[PDB]
């Protein structure tokens, strides 16, 4: 009973990158934590979504912020996000078959490249996008911003939309939920948004929306 | 479980240990493996507990009803009744059951019935797991026509030997002597048999 | 679970423990593992206890038929053939574990039956997964000619051993005794050294703690005249 | 895979003086998805409480079952049933299925009409009685709930303090189950009346 | 087949105060339904005003915290007899458990302390090493009874103000280590009556900026 | 990985004021077959220490011959090697308890329950378990097998906690010993009635006693049972 | 098959239904209609294992078809719900079950108001305001969850369904060859002929 | 990956390959190019496992610009397949072989003409005038097979693909969203960028 | 297979069938399971032919190499080194190997090296299926200090009984007589035994 079920996502947008997580872990029907972090801070500049492994992750994330320390030790400059990215894609890719969980979203805004997110994979994938949605609970959150998504959202309005995606995914989804965990990445670095627990934040959104008239409250 | 069954000139005697297992745990110690069916016909009992148990009790059954209306059975009767369970039931019984009985006509007789429900008539039998121990001891010592004396001996020191090597048998040796005179039931106790 | 069964002068005595569980938790604190078959015919129960209770009120119920059909009291015996005939059709998938004692016309009598349909016949018994620390027990105390009150040490010292050592078993000791020529006593919670301490606080809350969204009357009585 | 945690759910008992508490979560899910949050587990036939976790479908089975046996009882013993009878008509109704049972952990509550003494009962999903004093605990977050209970619960409470106990006890167990949540239901139970309370609690 | 692992039972507890913090765990060792022992120690101090708890797998339990007080030596004479930070010991713990990552020690390990604020904490870690600060954390056996009475009585979920109905929540107030206490005997206390491995004795170790002390009670031995 | 072939059965210890006693069994079985008669499973290291070992014989038989090494080694290039310096219990049983673990991890156990014996230097009672798995623990009361299941029961009502071990004398531990051993003949089906036992005691030293035997057996009740159940005769 | 959704307005029930029927590898066909009429005022949409989802359709259809002649009237939808579950909850127990999921939408004509029942194939029945079966709720319950109200009309219902569809055919693998929606309401069933 | 095609007409080769990318339950992305510029005037389309696909074709693409910068000169398509498929023979006997599948559509400048090779995980190379990987073939090899001709332009040659892909939207089960079309001729390598 | 070496007053001697057998097939029916690895050490092999031959053919090797440096080697070593082989190897290997041999210093010995590679030094040692139905007989009639007649006698009695009963024993019996005067070889035929 590894702990399992997540909602993670991460969106490119006119103002950068929006990142939002629950913060739910269950080892099967037990609640583990509702507390977890599952965004990684690898550097400043660099943000991680944690889902499937925890250790896994959490370790190698951790790994690449090293990795991209010595890189601009050595270089004298900021490491891109495709280079970053790849740093981690080739690492997993060589424990291939051994049994390492890993999805995760790979965040960063460049002078070169812009606002960049890579959808990094256990089994070697490794997507550029500019939304990605994943864990338990990712069908629900892809719902929610899909159909509200646009490039020219404000940073106000894009941070609402994927902390009300996560809502949507804690809602229904039973391996979801705990706290939503936002953050804003610019191009001078990644700006941290709060912690939001579930339970108080959707009352308070069903009755400013007026939605999930299912629910009573 | 170490079983034997031994014809001799006045009739017949039913050996067997009273150790009963649950894996390694000795379950009960004690144990009654000589088991009566009729007057003079009883059986030794080998294999699973439960079956056996039902077995017997079914044939004693059976032998009761057919001597309401027939009068006393022969030792080859019992063993039948014993094979029809055996043999039909082979699928779903675990039992290997040794026979033994004294009629006037016939005098002592011995029927071993193995796991496949077969029938042998010998004029001696051994079994259960202990019993492989003491193939050669059992060939070599066996004579017939022995006295009552030296049959309580035979089987005393076979199973003391069945029951030194095999960690499902042990306890007490209990005998059941089948005659003319009578159902004699007799006990020996580890002091008594481990010293031979 | 802990059971057992002494045989003592002019009668015999059961004890059992009280715990029942499911996986490593308790599930009952203070089980009732002895069951009335008859008045003088008691037994106790271990394994599954859906079953145990199921074989004995069905036997118990068909030796109260059989009893008033033959003008008869119930014998040990009778409930002891009924019980292992009804196990062994089953095929042992009724895991009902019994130590079957009581008294009767024909004396006193103890018996154990397993799941599968085979008995035993012995002066002490014990069966469970604690039987084995009540059993150490029992062959290093056990003697021939036992009075009652010696009996009664032995069975709960018996249980007590399977109480503390093992984890299937726990809580208190049931005791019954049945005696010849007399009512058997059915000694429920005869030992009782596992009281919780008191707690260090207390957890009752301020009213109007819970959130509440709605109240309303539950309507049990029927439908109303008028 | 497992009947008895598809669906998800809870119920909870408690005795108190001269009274007696039964509670549930409303959560109805499909293994992850959450289906409903108006799945209500206890039913009532007279004055005898039933709650039931377990298998959505046999939980409605045998309240339908239930319901169809108490009014047979009423219309020939020309009186509603009691806790103590009913109670044994559960294990009964449940031990028939020996081998392919109902998968269910159902939970009795009421006041004997006659008598006037509380009275709570814990059931197997094949018939096995747990008649405790104190409390009884059924479904996904049991585990949860004999923690609350255990060091929540003391004997003799009133029916508004036994109240706030037997809702702090669910509420909290619930919350650390993934399967159980999404609202519930507490019932107050006196000799001629009966309270029903919604709680409010967090939906996810 | 060889099975490498096994369970040996038992429940441990980490509490973070405001300027203390404690570790406890409950005293019997178990291997399916026997009892090993009624008095193994499963919380050691480790020097550096670190508490530490492996829980699961004794052996593997007894192999962790080995190496850890082994890095806590080798760390002061690679740099300087420097004091080995709570956060510095956590992630050291992490690269112990990963690098076994695909053999596991089969463990949920727990450490104690102080930050470098003063101020307790407690940190929390999975088999294979993925850790978190916690200011509330049960590991082992009963865990899943003790965690739901915590986060109703340290962290007053569910709680509210009474009069207002549902609309103030119970503040947050700061817990004692008399308080603190009380919480563990009677968590302990109740996962005892209702788990069968949890019995026999609770040792907690208490962290503050005078040291560690030790704390022994007795419980249930049946 | 693999399974054990000639096999040894319960190892059964306890503490007692002075010091420590434990008791085997000499019997080697082959599954079913009761195989050896004469198998010494107890092993003195020095006279402080015994070192009681149950499971696969053949692994006995190599710790045995590590253990013998031991003293071998620890007395090279040391004048304190029978004084101040002299192999501890503490000291072998942690050199065991490291190489079984090691070898658990490497998936080739030696197929043992192990639990060692003895009194230290500063005169402390020292016992404590040790297995295939690695797993350790210490106890007033130690058993293997099925030790565990019938001997600590009936061990643990002399010494149930620390404070009575003080309480506890030598001739009641070791009857309590002896008794065990018995009820072990009685019910478990791989057992023999010949045993060793051996005391270390701080005072008087190591006392290895072989050739024991399981006597005043209680058997004679016997002969009133018959049948199982109806049966009369 | 596939996809079946479900959703409960003011004054009516709508039902949308996969048209793609698969063998493995192909597309058999790509018009068909997942569902029968029960009643005049009760229609009940499927999909589970092939063979077995007519079959049970057809089976319920006649049984309530047979009840409407010998009574000279029609079964409330919570009445033809019962039925349904009773009939699956009896097969899940069976040598072979019925492995089939069902939507029942029915408007109660006494009651003058709308009904939308979710009973899947072990028997387990619940009445929603909008409902699903299989993946198909995984997509479209966040969006139902944010939009929906009960006081809604027919036209907002469908406009609401689209929405659905569209995140469908966005996220799922399988070309289920869009949906054929049919509405029940007081007047009642007929089909959107353009979606 | 899903589908990927290739035709070799008179003076160019097309390679068509699908845009979706599946994780499972939903489709993370509806614009992924599953190729590679090996050369200028090699182009190598891919699908198989996750990961082992970019890898694969990523390791071949560095060596192919390491061998051009080396001796100043591009490999002939037939001297790159020859490379590919001994890679992936290599791989088939390794610890964990590669699971890709590719198409090698390439101009060979010397002979003036277009090639198009087809080479499998187990290093099975085939010089084909079309080709295709997985089930693509079992559909779109029958059209193929009636209106190919080797004096194809390569407008025709575009509208025979589209004739494929609409058979295949048409009776694949999985929605592949489309495919990126690139063409191959003595100029280069170009997108046509309205399919 | 039945296989036994028993030390008597004047040293020891080493007995065995000469049956190898394919599933119920005979192999070989004259089979020679006793086997020199030094002029007056010998063993009795059962198990795998294969592993047995190999495991010997390495002792030979390591006790001429012995012998080349250090002398003539003790039976004990002997012992030990086919103990190092069966134990290291316990895995792979299916060997149940008694050792045999005459010092002038310690006389006759034997050792039993089981399955699992352990070393049990015995006065007289039975092995190979068909030792499992002699463990009685074995038990009862070895005396110590027998003479060479007495000790020929019992291996004789002891494996007739043994290829009696067990289907993987037969043919001859061998048997290797090692004391101060040499080494002698003896064969017993059928029509011999199993009229005894
Ligand atoms: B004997 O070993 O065959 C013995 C005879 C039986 C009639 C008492 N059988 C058993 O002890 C069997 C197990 C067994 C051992 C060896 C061979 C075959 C079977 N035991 C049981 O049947 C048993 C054990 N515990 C409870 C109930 N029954
Ligand atoms: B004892 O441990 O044998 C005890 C005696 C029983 C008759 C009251 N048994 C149990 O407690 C059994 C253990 C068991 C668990 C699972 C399957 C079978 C047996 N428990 C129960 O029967 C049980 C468990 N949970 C609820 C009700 N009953
Ligand atoms: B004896 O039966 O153990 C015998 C001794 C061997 C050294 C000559 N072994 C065999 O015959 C074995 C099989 C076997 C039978 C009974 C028990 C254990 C093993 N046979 C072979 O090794 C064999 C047979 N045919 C060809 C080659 N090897
Ligand atoms: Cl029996
Ligand atoms: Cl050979
Ligand atoms: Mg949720
Ligand atoms: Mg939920
Ligand atoms: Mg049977
Ligand atoms: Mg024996
Ligand atoms: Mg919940
Ligand atoms: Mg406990
Ligand atoms: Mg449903």
New interface residues.
């Given amino acids: 009973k590894?702990?399992h079920?997540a909602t993670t996502l991460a969106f490119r947008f006119q103002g950068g990158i929006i990142v939002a997580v629950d913060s739910?872990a269950?080892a099967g029907?037990?609640?583990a934590?509702?507390?977890?972090?599952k965004v990684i801070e690898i550097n400043p500049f660099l943000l991680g979504t944690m889902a499937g492994?925890?250790?896994?992750?959490?370790?190698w994330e951790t790994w690449l912020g090293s990795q991209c320390r010595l890189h601009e030790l050595r270089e004298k400059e900021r490491i891109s996000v495709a280079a970053a990215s790849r740093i981690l894609?080739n690492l997993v890719?060589q424990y291939?078959?051994?049994?390492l969980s890993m999805?995760t979203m790979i965040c960063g805004y460049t002078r070169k490249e812009g606002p960049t997110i890579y959808?990094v994979?256990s089994?070697?994938?490794?997507?550029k996008?500019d939304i990605?949605?994943v864990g338990?609970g990712?069908?629900?959150?892809?719902?929610?911003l899909?159909?509200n998504y646009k490039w020219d959202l404000s940073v106000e309005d894009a941070l609402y939309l994927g902390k009300r995606?996560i809502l949507?995914?804690?809602?229904?989804?039973?391996?979801?939920?705990?706290s939503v965990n936002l953050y804003h990445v610019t191009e001078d670095g990644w700006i941290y948004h709060g912690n939001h627990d579930?339970?108080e934040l959707?009352?308070k959104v069903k009755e400013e929306?007026?939605?999930?008239?299912?629910?009573?409250? | 479980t170490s079983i034997m069954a031994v014809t001799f000139k006045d009739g017949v005697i039913l050996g067997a240990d009273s150790r009963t297992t649950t894996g390694a745990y000795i379950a009960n110690r004690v144990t009654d493996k000589l088991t009566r069916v009729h007057d003079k016909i009883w059986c030794c009992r080998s294999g699973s507990a439960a079956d056996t148990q039902a077995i017997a009790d079914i044939v004693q059954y059976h032998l009761e009803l057919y001597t309401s209306q027939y009068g006393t059975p022969s030792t080859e009767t019992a063993a039948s009744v014993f094979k029809e369970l055996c043999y039909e039931n082979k699928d779903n019984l675990t039992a290997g059951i040794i026979v033994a009985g004294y009629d006037d006509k016939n005098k002592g007789e011995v029927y071993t019935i193995p796991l496949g429900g077969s029938v042998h008539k010998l004029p001696y039998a051994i079994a259960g797991s202990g019993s492989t121990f003491i193939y050669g001891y059992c060939d070599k010592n066996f004579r017939e026509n022995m006295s009552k004396e030296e049959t309580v001996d035979f089987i005393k020191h076979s199973l003391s030997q069945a029951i030194k090597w095999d960690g499902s048998s042990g306890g007490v040796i209990r005998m059941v002597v089948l005659t003319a005179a009578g159902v004699e039931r007799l006990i020996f106790y580890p002091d008594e048999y481990e010293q031979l | 679970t802990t059971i057992v069964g002494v045989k003592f002068n002019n009668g015999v005595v059961i004890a059992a423990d009280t715990r029942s569980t499911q996986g490593p938790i308790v599930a009952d604190k203070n089980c009732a593992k002895l069951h009335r078959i008859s008045p003088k015919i008691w037994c106790a129960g271990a394994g599954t206890a859906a079953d145990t209770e199921a074989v004995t009120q069905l036997i118990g119920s068909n030796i109260e038929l059989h009893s008033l059909y033959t003008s008869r009291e119930p014998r040990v015996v009778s409930a002891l053939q009924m019980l292992k005939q009804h196990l062994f059709k089953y095929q042992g998938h009724i895991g009902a574990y019994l130590i079957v004692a009581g008294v009767d016309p024909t004396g006193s009598h103890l018996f154990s039956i397993h799941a599968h349909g085979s008995t035993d016949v012995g002066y002490y018994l014990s069966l469970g997964s604690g039987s084995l620390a009540a059993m150490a027990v029992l062959e290093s105390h056990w003697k021939q000619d036992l009075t009652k009150e010696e009996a009664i040490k032995l069975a709960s010292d018996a249980i007590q051993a399977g109480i503390w050592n093992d984890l299937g078993s726990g809580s208190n000791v049931d005791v019954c005794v049945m005696e010849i020529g007399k009512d058997a006593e059915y000694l429920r919670n005869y030992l009782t050294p596992n009281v919780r301490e008191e707690k260090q606080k207390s957890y009752k809350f301020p009213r109007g703690t819970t959130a509440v969204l709605k109240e309303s009357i539950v309507n049990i009585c029927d439908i109303q005249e008028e | 895979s497992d009947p008895s945690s598809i669906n998800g759910g809870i119920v909870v008992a408690m005795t108190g003086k001269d009274c007696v508490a039964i509670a549930c979560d409303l959560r109805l899910g499909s293994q992850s998805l959450g289906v409903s949050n108006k799945f209500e587990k206890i039913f009532h036939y007279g004055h005898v409480f039933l709650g039931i976790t377990g298998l959505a479908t046999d939980v409605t089975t045998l309240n339908e079952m239930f319901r169809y046996k108490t009014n047979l009882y009423k219309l020939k013993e020309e009186r509603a049933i009691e806790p103590e009878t009913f109670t044994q008509l559960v294990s009964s109704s449940l031990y028939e299925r020996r081998f392919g049972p109902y998968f269910v952990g159902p939970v009795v509550a009421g006041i004997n009409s006659k008598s006037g003494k509380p009275f709570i009962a814990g059931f197997d999903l094949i018939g096995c009685i747990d008649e405790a004093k104190d409390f009884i605990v059924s479904g996904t977050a049991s585990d949860q709930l004999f923690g609350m209970c255990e060091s929540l619960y003391e004997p003799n409470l009133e029916p508004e303090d036994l109240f706030e106990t037997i809702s702090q006890a669910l509420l909290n167990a619930a919350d650390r189950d993934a399967l159980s949540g999404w609202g519930a239901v507490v019932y107050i139970i006196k000799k001629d009346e009966v309270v029903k309370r919604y709680l409010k609690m967090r939906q996810d | 087949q060889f099975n490498p692992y096994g369970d040996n039972g038992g429940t441990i507890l980490g509490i973070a105060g405001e300027d203390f913090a404690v570790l406890a765990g409950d005293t019997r060792n178990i291997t399916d339904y026997s009892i090993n022992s009624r008095y193994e120690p499963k919380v050691f101090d480790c020097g550096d005003n670190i508490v530490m708890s492996a829980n699961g797998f004794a052996a593997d339990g007894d192999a962790l915290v080995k190496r850890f007080k082994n890095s806590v030596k080798w760390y002061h004479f690679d740099h300087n007899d420097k004091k080995l930070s709570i956060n510095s010991a956590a992630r050291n713990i992490q690269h112990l458990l990963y690098g076994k990552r695909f053999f596991p020690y089969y463990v949920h390990t727990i450490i104690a302390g102080l930050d470098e604020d003063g101020k307790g904490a407690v940190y929390s870690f999975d088999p294979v090493g993925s850790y978190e600060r916690e200011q509330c954390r049960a590991g082992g056996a009963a865990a899943s009874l003790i965690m739901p009475f915590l986060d109703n009585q340290v962290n007053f979920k569910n709680q509210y103000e009474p009069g207002t109905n549902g609309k103030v929540k119970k503040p947050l107030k700061y817990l004692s280590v008399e308080e603190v206490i009380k919480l563990v005997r009677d968590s302990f206390t109740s996962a005892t009556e209702r788990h069968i491995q949890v019995g026999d004795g609770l040792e907690i170790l208490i962290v503050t900026k005078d040291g560690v002390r030790k704390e022994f009670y007795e419980l249930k031995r049946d | 990985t693999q399974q054990p072939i000639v096999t040894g059965t319960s190892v059964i210890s306890m503490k007692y004021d002075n010091g420590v006693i434990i008791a085997a069994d000499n019997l080697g079985s082959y599954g079913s077959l009761l195989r050896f008669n004469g198998v010494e499973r107890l092993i003195p290291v020095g006279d402080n220490t015994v070192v009681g070992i149950s499971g696969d014989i053949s692994d006995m038989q190599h710790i045995e011959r590590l253990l013998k090494d031991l003293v071998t080694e620890n007395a090279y290039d040391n004048p304190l090697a029978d004084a101040e310096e002299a192999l501890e219990p503490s000291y072998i049983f942690e050199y065991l308890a490291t190489v079984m673990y090691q070898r658990r991890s490497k998936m080739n156990p030696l197929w043992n329950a192990i639990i060692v014996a003895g009194v230290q230097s500063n005169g402390d009672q020292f016992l404590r378990y040790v297995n295939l798995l690695g797993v350790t623990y210490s106890s007033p009361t130690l058993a293997t097998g099925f030790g565990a299941h019938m001997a600590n029961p009936l061990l643990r009502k002399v010494v149930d906690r620390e404070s009575d071990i003080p309480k506890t004398t030598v001739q009641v531990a070791e009857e309590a010993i002896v008794n065990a051993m018995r009820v072990l003949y009685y019910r478990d089906a791989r057992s023999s009635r010949n045993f060793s036992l051996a005391i270390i005691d701080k005072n008087t030293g190591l006392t290895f006693k072989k050739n024991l035997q399981v006597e005043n057996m209680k058997w004679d009740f016997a002969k009133d049972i018959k049948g199982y159940g109806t049966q009369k005769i | 098959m596939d996809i079946i959704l479900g959703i409960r307005v003011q004054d009516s029930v709508i039902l949308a239904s996969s048209k793609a029927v698969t063998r493995g590898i192909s597309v058999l066909k790509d018009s068909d209609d997942k569902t029968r009429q029960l009643s005049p005022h009760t229609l009940m949409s499927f999909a589970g294992e092939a063979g077995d989802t007519v079959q049970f359709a057809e089976y319920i259809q006649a049984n309530i078809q047979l009840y409407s002649i010998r009574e000279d009237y029609e079964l409330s939808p919570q009445a033809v719900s019962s039925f349904v579950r009773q009939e699956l909850a009896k097969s899940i127990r069976s040598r072979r079950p019925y492995q089939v999921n069902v939507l029942i939408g029915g408007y109660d004509k006494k009651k003058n108001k709308p009904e939308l029942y979710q009973i899947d194939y072990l028997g387990t029945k619940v009445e929603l305001p909008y409902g699903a079966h299989g993946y198909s709720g995984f997509y479209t319950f966040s969006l139902l969850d944010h939009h929906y109200r009960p006081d809604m009309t027919t036209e907002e219902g469908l406009d609401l369904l689209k929405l659905c569809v569209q995140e469908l055919e966005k996220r799922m693998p399988m070309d289920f060859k869009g949906v054929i929606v049919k509405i029940v309401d007081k007047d009642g069933i007929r089909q959107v002929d353009d979606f």
Avoid: M, P
């Fill in positions: 590894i702990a079920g739910r269950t029907n037990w609640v934590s509702q507390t977890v972090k492994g925890a250790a896994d992750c959490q370790f894609s890719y291939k078959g051994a049994g999805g959808y994979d089994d070697g994938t490794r997507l996008g990605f949605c338990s990712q069908t629900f959150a892809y719902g929610v899909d159909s995606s949507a995914a804690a809602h229904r989804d039973a391996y979801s939920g705990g579930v339970g959707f009352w929306e007026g939605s999930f008239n299912n629910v009573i409250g």
